[PDB]
Amino acid sequence: RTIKVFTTVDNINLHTQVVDMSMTYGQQFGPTYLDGADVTKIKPHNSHEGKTFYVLPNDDTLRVEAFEYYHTTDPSFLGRYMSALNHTKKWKYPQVNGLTSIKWADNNSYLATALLTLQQIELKFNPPALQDAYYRARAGEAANFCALILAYCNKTVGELGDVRETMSYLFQHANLDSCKRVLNVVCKTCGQQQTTLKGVEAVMYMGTLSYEQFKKGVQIPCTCGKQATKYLVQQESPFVMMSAPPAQYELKHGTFTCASEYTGNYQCGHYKHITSKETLYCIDGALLTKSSEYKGPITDVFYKENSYTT
Amino acid sequence: KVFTTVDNINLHTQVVQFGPTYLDGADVTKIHNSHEGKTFYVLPNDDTLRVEAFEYYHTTDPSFLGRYMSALNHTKKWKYPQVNGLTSIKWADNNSYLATALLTLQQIELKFNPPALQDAYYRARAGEAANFCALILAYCNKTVGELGDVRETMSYLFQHANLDSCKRVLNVVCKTCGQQQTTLKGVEAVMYMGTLSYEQFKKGVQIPCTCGKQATKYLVQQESPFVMMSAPPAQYELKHGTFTCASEYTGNYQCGHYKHITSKETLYCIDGALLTKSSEYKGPITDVFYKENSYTT
Amino acid sequence: VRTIKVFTTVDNINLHTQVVDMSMTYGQQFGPTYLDGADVTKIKPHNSHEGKTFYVLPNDDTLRVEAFEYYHTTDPSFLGRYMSALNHTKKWKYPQVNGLTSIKWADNNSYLATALLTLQQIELKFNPPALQDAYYRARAGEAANFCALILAYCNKTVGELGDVRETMSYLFQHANLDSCKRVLNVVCKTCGQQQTTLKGVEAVMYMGTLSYEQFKKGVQIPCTCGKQATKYLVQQESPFVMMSAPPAQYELKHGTFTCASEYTGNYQCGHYKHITSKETLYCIDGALLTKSSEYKGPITDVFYKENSYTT
Amino acid sequence: EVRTIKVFTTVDNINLHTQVVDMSMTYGQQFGPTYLDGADVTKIKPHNSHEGKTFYVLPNDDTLRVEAFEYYHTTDPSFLGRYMSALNHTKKWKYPQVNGLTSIKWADNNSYLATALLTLQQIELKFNPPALQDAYYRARAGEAANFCALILAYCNKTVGELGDVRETMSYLFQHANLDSCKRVLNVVCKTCGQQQTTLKGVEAVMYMGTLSYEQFKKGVQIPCTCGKQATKYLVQQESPFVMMSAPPAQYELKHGTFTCASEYTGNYQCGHYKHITSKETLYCIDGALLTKSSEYKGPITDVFYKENSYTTT
Ligand SMILES: [Zn+2]
Ligand SMILES: [Zn+2]
Numbered sequence A: 001r002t003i004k005v006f007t008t009v010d011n012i013n014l015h016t017q018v019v020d021m022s023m024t025y026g027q028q029f030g031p032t033y034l035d036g037a038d039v040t041k042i043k044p045h046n047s048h049e050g051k052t053f054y055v056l057p058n059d060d061t062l063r064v065e066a067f068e069y070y071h072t073t074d075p076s077f078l079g080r081y082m083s084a085l086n087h088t089k090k091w092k093y094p095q096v097n098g099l100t101s102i103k104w105a106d107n108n109s110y111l112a113t114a115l116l117t118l119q120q121i122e123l124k125f126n127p128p129a130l131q132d133a134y135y136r137a138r139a140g141e142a143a144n145f146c147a148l149i150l151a152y153c154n155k156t157v158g159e160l161g162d163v164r165e166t167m168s169y170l171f172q173h174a175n176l177d178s179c180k181r182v183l184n185v186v187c188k189t190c191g192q193q194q195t196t197l198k199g200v201e202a203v204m205y206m207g208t209l210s211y212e213q214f215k216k217g218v219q220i221p222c223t224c225g226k227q228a229t230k231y232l233v234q235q236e237s238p239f240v241m242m243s244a245p246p247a248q249y250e251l252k253h254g255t256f257t258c259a260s261e262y263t264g265n266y267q268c269g270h271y272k273h274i275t276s277k278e279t280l281y282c283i284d285g286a287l288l289t290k291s292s293e294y295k296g297p298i299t300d301v302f303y304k305e306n307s308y309t310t
Numbered sequence B: 001k002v003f004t005t006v007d008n009i010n011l012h013t014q015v016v017q018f019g020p021t022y023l024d025g026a027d028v029t030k031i032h033n034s035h036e037g038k039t040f041y042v043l044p045n046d047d048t049l050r051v052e053a054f055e056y057y058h059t060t061d062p063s064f065l066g067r068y069m070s071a072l073n074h075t076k077k078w079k080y081p082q083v084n085g086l087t088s089i090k091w092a093d094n095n096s097y098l099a100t101a102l103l104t105l106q107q108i109e110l111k112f113n114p115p116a117l118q119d120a121y122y123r124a125r126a127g128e129a130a131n132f133c134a135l136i137l138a139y140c141n142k143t144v145g146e147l148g149d150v151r152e153t154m155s156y157l158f159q160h161a162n163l164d165s166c167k168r169v170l171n172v173v174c175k176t177c178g179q180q181q182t183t184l185k186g187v188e189a190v191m192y193m194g195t196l197s198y199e200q201f202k203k204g205v206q207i208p209c210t211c212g213k214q215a216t217k218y219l220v221q222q223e224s225p226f227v228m229m230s231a232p233p234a235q236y237e238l239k240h241g242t243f244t245c246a247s248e249y250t251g252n253y254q255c256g257h258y259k260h261i262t263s264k265e266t267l268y269c270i271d272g273a274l275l276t277k278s279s280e281y282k283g284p285i286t287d288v289f290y291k292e293n294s295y296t297t
Numbered sequence C: 001v002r003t004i005k006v007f008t009t010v011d012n013i014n015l016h017t018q019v020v021d022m023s024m025t026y027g028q029q030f031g032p033t034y035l036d037g038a039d040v041t042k043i044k045p046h047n048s049h050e051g052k053t054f055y056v057l058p059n060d061d062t063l064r065v066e067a068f069e070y071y072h073t074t075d076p077s078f079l080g081r082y083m084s085a086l087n088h089t090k091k092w093k094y095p096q097v098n099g100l101t102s103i104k105w106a107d108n109n110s111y112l113a114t115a116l117l118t119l120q121q122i123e124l125k126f127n128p129p130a131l132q133d134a135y136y137r138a139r140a141g142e143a144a145n146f147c148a149l150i151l152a153y154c155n156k157t158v159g160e161l162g163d164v165r166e167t168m169s170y171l172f173q174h175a176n177l178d179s180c181k182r183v184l185n186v187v188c189k190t191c192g193q194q195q196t197t198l199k200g201v202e203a204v205m206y207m208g209t210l211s212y213e214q215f216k217k218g219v220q221i222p223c224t225c226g227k228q229a230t231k232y233l234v235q236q237e238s239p240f241v242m243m244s245a246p247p248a249q250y251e252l253k254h255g256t257f258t259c260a261s262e263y264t265g266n267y268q269c270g271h272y273k274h275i276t277s278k279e280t281l282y283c284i285d286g287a288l289l290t291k292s293s294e295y296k297g298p299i300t301d302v303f304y305k306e307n308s309y310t311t
Numbered sequence D: 001e002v003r004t005i006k007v008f009t010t011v012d013n014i015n016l017h018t019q020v021v022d023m024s025m026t027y028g029q030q031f032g033p034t035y036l037d038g039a040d041v042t043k044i045k046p047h048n049s050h051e052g053k054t055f056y057v058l059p060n061d062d063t064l065r066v067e068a069f070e071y072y073h074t075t076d077p078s079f080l081g082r083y084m085s086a087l088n089h090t091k092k093w094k095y096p097q098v099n100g101l102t103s104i105k106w107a108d109n110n111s112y113l114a115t116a117l118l119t120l121q122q123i124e125l126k127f128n129p130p131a132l133q134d135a136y137y138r139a140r141a142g143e144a145a146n147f148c149a150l151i152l153a154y155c156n157k158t159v160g161e162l163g164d165v166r167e168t169m170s171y172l173f174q175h176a177n178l179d180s181c182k183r184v185l186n187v188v189c190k191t192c193g194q195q196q197t198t199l200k201g202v203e204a205v206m207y208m209g210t211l212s213y214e215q216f217k218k219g220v221q222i223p224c225t226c227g228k229q230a231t232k233y234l235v236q237q238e239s240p241f242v243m244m245s246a247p248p249a250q251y252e253l254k255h256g257t258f259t260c261a262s263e264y265t266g267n268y269q270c271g272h273y274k275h276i277t278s279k280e281t282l283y284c285i286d287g288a289l290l291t292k293s294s295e296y297k298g299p300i301t302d303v304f305y306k307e308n309s310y311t312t313t
């Protein structure tokens, strides 16, 4: 009339619980998952004796362990993650030019480029769930990782994704604490003026794709209206991410690590991944083609960095 | 010496002018010697061509053939693999909605009225479905690449099928205002919006009444070869052998993707060119189609 | 147990006395019930309703007959759809324009005004008494009954796309066109000459050309062989002809025609205007009136006077 | 031998850029697609009067792209094109005032734009893109033609194309500042159990499935994956208005009980929206026409209610 079972939010803590066998797991735990399967409407069939189930964080020690694993506190995180996972484990993640990609499915082009970029920049995620899923994605098993990205960005399977917005969300969960970007500008009405940026904001700029153009200054307007020049004074980070609204722009081999291109219906668009290895490579989900140069609508280009002073 | 047509049945003899002109969905307007005795399409710019066009497509819109050819330029480059015995469409240009419709039409008994459609459908059933798809786009006023709604698409297409043998009778009761029995015919006899479950439609569903109370609507009589039930996408469970086929939609109104579920020996999910078999299927369903001949409560 | 006597009707001619419990709504007792076009199904009777007449739907074998002989439709849904249409058409304006009753634009109704304006310009007689009555009332500036009836007969709802050509065919089926006959000949070089005879609606509508003289001089059409045949009018016995074709730029010359209909705008949710030839050309566009020496436009249907003709 | 004027080009019409035009080359060749007050001038020879006039041009360089990302909050390269094409038609529309609001006399199947436009003057809304916000003020003042063109292009709809009020409010609401809006819902199934979900932003102000906000407070039936009918209700709602939509159905509006609603006559292909607002009594605004009524019965499809902060009992 009862069965012994375990419930967890992070798959490591496993609190014991005694289940009625006359009630549904849902009646007892709220929404409940057995190996990704939604068993909320189900009554114990023995079998589960000894098994472990995923629950949403109902009590206060569950919310703690969940925050410590996912570094979020949204009650609806475990469930949006499983909603998306029901579809992501059905995708197929082939290796492409050494890297783990995703074949087209459910308008995921922006996820495949996002994931191919993450494997070329050196980045380590604080939240234990992310880093574990990120290592498994590197091994060809990126289903958990993709379902985590969708959940961290508040996106459902199939919605329109935006690479810059997707990476902005993830980079806040990445260990970018030690990244410094220092910017100075010439007379507005102030001659010189100096600012400093830290963390996620240090490695991200909207407005121009050319890292060198950014090094050598960009003329942006100033408080009175005089077109001053912003220039990269110093930079300390493992990479930088230059974005800009999309236009015909030319990817010159050996001048950037990787980049993303957006084509097709603007509202439900398509993304392609451009990476520079021996020659320029275009990774398109599962379709790989090589070329000496590239021209297309480029949104966001990725470059590697150690330290920079001008 | 060539042939200009609008419908491919009636050839007008020419020598070589025509206006916007097509040979196999390529815009050869702004331009040989191997084009001898080969048919060309053109836009109807005379009363004889407009009547030929009306008779063949069942449209009087001057732009139909235009948009037909425009769409066909892309759909000729789509692939149409055979999947589980049906013609489907390799994903491209956000066409999942066209694939699901296409896979549904083969599984339900339907007769199109306009010669263009019935002939294009037979080719699609044979594997050459570029014309059928391009007709659907033009009938629905959609361009390649635009996102599409399967419920919308079937409504447009059913407008062009013989469904006047299909009769549906419904009963509604509110506690204050009594009963109202209504007879629906044609397209409204096969399409219902509000719920996915056919059995629940027979047993009553709660809908609002101007009264203010919730009334309850149920199916009294039904004469048709199939029915189609729709509702906003929502997690829903499909059980082998209780339905004919169904559509799943991931995402939202701006950008999403359809897949197709069919019930054979086991549940098969067709996702364009890919097929995965399944003992059960749950996901966000939006349309379910059921076999029918004659039901009376 | 308060009660009153009231009348229930399907046609507002044959009235049936009923006694109604006042503790029960009209809906419980009759089904859908109306009082001068207003849904009163949810309400219980008042003292004041007393010998008033109420509209119901056909809910017994005897009522289904009165509806048939009055509307010439067996379709059970017909009276309910007419009432729903009437909720909005009673709200439409029916101003006079140039001796004719028209309809101020509303609810994508441009096709109904062209249809109505045409009907007051051609001799025609409807069989269904309901239609005939609504028509007379239409001429008198009270066309709401008529519009609701056309909608019902054409299975369209308020605001939907209408089609002047579909609309008129529907109606003509409800007109006495038995004294109308047309004869045509098709001569193909390969196949020969065959004559067919047309009786009824088929006799007064052609779908190939807006030009009635052309139909007399012959028009080219497909032939079962493959060659363009030529079909021409040998004789026409009818009060009018309606010539229709897919819309094209086309010139309406003064005095050569009774009236036409123009179709513009988004083809999927389009606009119609009415062209009628009097002392000058008059383009009636709902409430607005224009007057011109000539007219070029995308004409969709042309109406012509006719009594008898032999080529 | 040579002739030139000085025009301004812009993307936002705030950052004017001084340009000398070779009066031997159409604005097109010099600038690319160029517009004057929504009129395409790509391939028209310049004029001598065209001096000092502000010209709109496509963003064809990094600086303008960013001037235009800050202004329209969209990076779609066709935005200006679609905005100007709409604009050239919406400047020809009439903007009569009905009942103190800016409406639109009917043309080009614009009824859905008028209802939306009337609705946006009665609900507390703030837009994030300066372009919508800037046009919004002008629209209230009585000059709404620029606003209407922006709506058209933010929604990817063209003049004359049939529109859907609910679809358009959704698009526009994504550009509203709605992060201080929060909705807590609770679903209860006899079999499957209890689950509470929270919504923010647009998802907190729009609900589809019922017209009545009071039912939503009291409980609406919806299918559950178990197969039973579950019950959902408003635990906690916090926003200045709420929006309730249902597929159009005969339904009664009652004075004082709401802010405004939309009536729809037609089907999925051709249709007409009307507007209803609750002031001293009910007012049906049909573009230009105004007609009064004590109570309103018709095919309602969207209802708007005012809100402050509501927590269930
Ligand atoms: Zn200054
Ligand atoms: Zn009721």
Ligand SMILES: [Zn+2]
Pocket (backbone or CB within 6 Å): C188, C189, C190, C191, C192, C223, C224, C225, C226, C227
């Ligand atoms: Zn022949």
Ligand SMILES: [Zn+2]
Pocket (backbone or CB within 6 Å): A041, D189, D190, D191, D192, D193, D224, D225, D226, D227, D228
């Ligand atoms: Zn349940």
